[PDB]
Enzyme design. Structure first.
Site, PDB file in Angstrom:
ATOM      1  CG  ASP A 101      39.886  27.374  44.762  1.00  0.00           C
ATOM      2  OD1 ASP A 101      40.966  26.750  44.784  1.00  0.00           O
ATOM      3  OD2 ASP A 101      39.809  28.620  44.782  1.00  0.00           O
ATOM      4  CB  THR A 102      42.016  21.600  45.592  1.00  0.00           C
ATOM      5  OG1 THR A 102      42.938  22.130  44.631  1.00  0.00           O
ATOM      6  CG2 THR A 102      41.090  20.584  44.914  1.00  0.00           C
ATOM      7  N   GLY A 103      42.395  24.823  46.553  1.00  0.00           N
ATOM      8  CA  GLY A 103      43.198  25.796  47.257  1.00  0.00           C
ATOM      9  C   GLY A 103      42.430  26.673  48.215  1.00  0.00           C
TER      10      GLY A 103
HETATM   11  C1  XUV Z   1      37.007  38.586  36.892  1.00  0.00           C
HETATM   12  C2  XUV Z   1      37.926  39.045  38.040  1.00  0.00           C
HETATM   13  O1  XUV Z   1      38.800  38.003  38.405  1.00  0.00           O
HETATM   14  P1  XUV Z   1      40.159  38.390  39.276  1.00  0.00           P
HETATM   15  O2  XUV Z   1      41.356  38.213  38.444  1.00  0.00           O
HETATM   16  C3  XUV Z   1      40.271  37.224  40.754  1.00  0.00           C
HETATM   17  O3  XUV Z   1      39.476  36.095  40.476  1.00  0.00           O
HETATM   18  C4  XUV Z   1      39.776  34.962  41.295  1.00  0.00           C
HETATM   19  C5  XUV Z   1      40.001  35.157  42.796  1.00  0.00           C
HETATM   20  C6  XUV Z   1      40.327  33.944  43.690  1.00  0.00           C
HETATM   21  C7  XUV Z   1      40.419  32.546  43.074  1.00  0.00           C
HETATM   22  C8  XUV Z   1      40.749  31.347  44.007  1.00  0.00           C
HETATM   23  C9  XUV Z   1      42.208  31.477  44.446  1.00  0.00           C
HETATM   24  N1  XUV Z   1      42.966  31.603  43.223  1.00  0.00           N
HETATM   25  C10 XUV Z   1      44.024  32.582  42.964  1.00  0.00           C
HETATM   26  O4  XUV Z   1      44.329  33.453  43.709  1.00  0.00           O
HETATM   27  O5  XUV Z   1      44.666  32.400  41.698  1.00  0.00           O
HETATM   28  C11 XUV Z   1      45.444  33.459  41.175  1.00  0.00           C
HETATM   29  C12 XUV Z   1      46.798  32.707  40.573  1.00  0.00           C
HETATM   30  O6  XUV Z   1      46.319  32.112  39.456  1.00  0.00           O
HETATM   31  C13 XUV Z   1      45.239  33.110  38.889  1.00  0.00           C
HETATM   32  O7  XUV Z   1      44.197  32.493  38.538  1.00  0.00           O
HETATM   33  C14 XUV Z   1      42.973  32.972  39.502  1.00  0.00           C
HETATM   34  C15 XUV Z   1      43.377  34.025  40.170  1.00  0.00           C
HETATM   35  C16 XUV Z   1      44.875  34.030  40.133  1.00  0.00           C
HETATM   36  C17 XUV Z   1      42.701  30.242  45.171  1.00  0.00           C
HETATM   37  O8  XUV Z   1      42.338  29.071  44.557  1.00  0.00           O
HETATM   38  C18 XUV Z   1      42.042  30.155  46.575  1.00  0.00           C
HETATM   39  N2  XUV Z   1      42.580  31.226  47.458  1.00  0.00           N
HETATM   40  C19 XUV Z   1      43.532  30.838  48.525  1.00  0.00           C
HETATM   41  C20 XUV Z   1      44.949  30.613  47.937  1.00  0.00           C
HETATM   42  C21 XUV Z   1      45.536  31.952  47.543  1.00  0.00           C
HETATM   43  C22 XUV Z   1      45.819  29.927  48.988  1.00  0.00           C
HETATM   44  C23 XUV Z   1      45.970  30.794  50.243  1.00  0.00           C
HETATM   45  S1  XUV Z   1      41.440  32.472  47.839  1.00  0.00           S
HETATM   46  O9  XUV Z   1      40.420  32.691  46.817  1.00  0.00           O
HETATM   47  O10 XUV Z   1      42.099  33.758  48.029  1.00  0.00           O
HETATM   48  C24 XUV Z   1      40.624  31.870  49.374  1.00  0.00           C
HETATM   49  C25 XUV Z   1      41.265  32.179  50.724  1.00  0.00           C
HETATM   50  C26 XUV Z   1      40.598  31.671  51.992  1.00  0.00           C
HETATM   51  C27 XUV Z   1      39.304  30.862  51.896  1.00  0.00           C
HETATM   52  O11 XUV Z   1      38.666  30.385  53.064  1.00  0.00           O
HETATM   53  C28 XUV Z   1      39.189  30.872  54.275  1.00  0.00           C
HETATM   54  C29 XUV Z   1      38.673  30.564  50.537  1.00  0.00           C
HETATM   55  C30 XUV Z   1      39.333  31.067  49.258  1.00  0.00           C
HETATM   56  C31 XUV Z   1      40.194  32.349  41.575  1.00  0.00           C
HETATM   57  C32 XUV Z   1      39.871  33.563  40.679  1.00  0.00           C
HETATM   58  O12 XUV Z   1      40.026  39.956  39.794  1.00  0.00           O
HETATM   59  C33 XUV Z   1      41.122  40.585  40.382  1.00  0.00           C
HETATM   60  C34 XUV Z   1      40.635  41.556  41.456  1.00  0.00           C
END
Ligand code: XUV
Lengths: 99, 99
Positions: free
Chosen positions: B25-27
């Site tokens: 996860d590059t994000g």
């Molecule tokens: C089976 C259940 O799954 P869910 O749907 C959720 O599962 C997922 C949850 C999170 C991710 C990864 C994050 N992706 C994400 O938000 O993507 C959204 C849009 O595209 C969709 O695809 C996947 C989800 C939707 C993102 O890459 C990284 N993030 C930061 C970003 C936001 C920049 C600030 S961060 O994780 O928050 C994070 C913050 C601070 C950190 O260090 C301090 C370390 C990590 C992938 C899947 O349940 C719903 C409750």
């Protein structure tokens, strides 16, 4: 280009004739941008992240230029903490992970 | 190797003598792992993303092996849906974005 990850992979994007900064996010399935005005019709949608769900406006077949590379795809607009470019568009520009 | 982004970039990791699947996860600034009872001290922390913030336990100098590449750094443990490998570890395995 080749982008290392010592810093956030932020790039400039062009959407709706406006420049913005966005994060190249291989962990995101979809592209989600902060609140903005985009022309055309939109569908309400919901997407879930680490801390729960947010309501977004779904815009389909939207042109967006990412670091000089054109894409035409779905853009979600809503209360995301940062503009994120997800895999739906990263694939269009030919982006891969390499190590 | 090279990983395309048609599907989620899921790989096998090894942590504390255990194999798991995790998302490159590059994000993600930091690495967030599913609930696990890791030994040693830790510090409470909160990380935010789409949807809001969650509470996690920060463990430091944790060794993780990602596709045979070793990495040592901070790991956050908490109620995340998916194991997330963030930039703090991706840099150590030489991971770049390329297009
Ligand atoms: C089976 C259940 O799954 P869910 O749907 C959720 O599962 C997922 C949850 C999170 C991710 C990864 C994050 N992706 C994400 O938000 O993507 C959204 C849009 O595209 C969709 O695809 C996947 C989800 C939707 C993102 O890459 C990284 N993030 C930061 C970003 C936001 C920049 C600030 S961060 O994780 O928050 C994070 C913050 C601070 C950190 O260090 C301090 C370390 C990590 C992938 C899947 O349940 C719903 C409750």
């Amino acid at each position: 280009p080749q982008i290392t990850l010592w810093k956030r992979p932020l790039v400039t994007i062009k959407i709706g004739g406006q420049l913005k900064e966005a994060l190249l996010d291989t962990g995101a399935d979809d592209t989600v941008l902060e609140e903005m005005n985009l022309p055309g019709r939109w569908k309400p949608k919901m997407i879930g992240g680490i801390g729960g769900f947010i309501k977004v406006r779904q815009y389909d077949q939207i042109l967006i230029e990412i670091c000089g590379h054109k894409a035409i795809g779905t853009v979600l607009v809503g209360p995301t903490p940062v503009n994120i470019i997800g895999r739906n568009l990263l694939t269009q520009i030919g982006c891969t992970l390499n190590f």
